[PDB]
Every structure is written in C-alpha cells, then in structure tokens.
Amino acid sequence: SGAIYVGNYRVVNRHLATHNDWANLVWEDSSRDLLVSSTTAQGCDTIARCDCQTGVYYCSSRRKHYPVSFSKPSLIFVEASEYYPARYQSHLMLAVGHSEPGDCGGILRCQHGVVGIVSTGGNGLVGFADVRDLLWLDEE
Numbered sequence: 001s002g003a004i005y006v007g008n009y010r011v012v013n014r015h016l017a018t019h020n021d022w023a024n025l026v027w028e029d030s031s032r033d034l035l036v037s038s039t040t041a042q043g044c045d046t047i048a049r050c051d052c053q054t055g056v057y058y059c060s061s062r063r064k065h066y067p068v069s070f071s072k073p074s075l076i077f078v079e080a081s082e083y084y085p086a087r088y089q090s091h092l093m094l095a096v097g098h099s100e101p102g103d104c105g106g107i108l109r110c111q112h113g114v115v116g117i118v119s120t121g122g123n124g125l126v127g128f129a130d131v132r133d134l135l136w137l138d139e140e
C-alpha cells in the first residue's frame with residue numbers, strides 16, 4: 001500500500017483505490033495502474049520533474065529502501081499478478097529488485113522528488129508507475 005500526497009491530490013495505484021477515492025475522482029488510467037483523488041488537506045510531497053534513472057524505492061515486504069537504476073517510462077508487457085491479467089502497462093519503469101503485491105504504493109524518489117510508485121513485481125524485477133509527466137499535479 002501507499003500514496004503520494006501533493007497539493008490537494010492523492011495518487012494511488014488504481015487497483016488499491018477506495019470508494020472515497022472514486023467519490024472524489026480527479027483522473028484515472030487503467031493502462032498506467034494510477035488513480036488520483038482530491039483531498040481536503042494540503043499534502044507536502046514534491047513530484048520529481050526530471051529524466052533521472054537512478055533513485056531509491058521503499059520495499060515494504062523487506063522493510064528496506066533500496067537504491068536502484070530504473071528504465072525510461074515505457075509500454076511494457078507484465079505477467080499476470082494477483083490484481084491484473086498479463087497485459088501491456090504504459091508509463092512503467094523497471095528495476096532489478098524485489099516487489100510483491102503488498103509493495104504496491106511504495107515511493108520511488110530521486111534528488112528532485114517522487115518519481116512514481118511501485119505497481120508491478122515478480123521475475124526479479126520491480127516496476128514503477130511514473131508520475132513525472134503529470135505536470136498538473138503541481139497546480140490547481
């Protein structure tokens with residue numbers, strides 16, 4: 001589990017979204033496994049605006065933050081998981097590392113802020129849903 005709290009937005013994995021998230025929906029995209037809902041309180045996370053390929057992610061299933069290199073956000077074929085069939089997922093970045101279903105929502109961060117959240121796992125790889133192209137999270 002986990003979210004990003006920027007401005008009056010909450011960013012979560014679409015497959016973990018709550019009733020309250022859908023009842024306060026701003027934007028969602030199945031293909032990216034992302035959903036954004038509106039918040040009453042201001043959040044304090046900063047979204048990275050960069051093309052970094054190194055950062056640190058939180059892995060709840062190891063209680064550890066791991067430094068990783070990660071790929072450019074792309075359309076990647078993902079194996080079936082407990083929450084999606086095998087499919088193409090867009091705006092996904094891979095690293096070599098551990099990720100199980102409960103790790104979804106863990107933050108990937110670089111020197112510029114939050115890059116994205118854990119979304120995929122298995123096969124010795126971790127996949128992150130990028131948020132750096134969602135420039136509207138910085139305003140409004």
Ligand SMILES: [Zn+2]
Nearest residue numbers: 050052110112
């Ligand atoms: Zn960066």
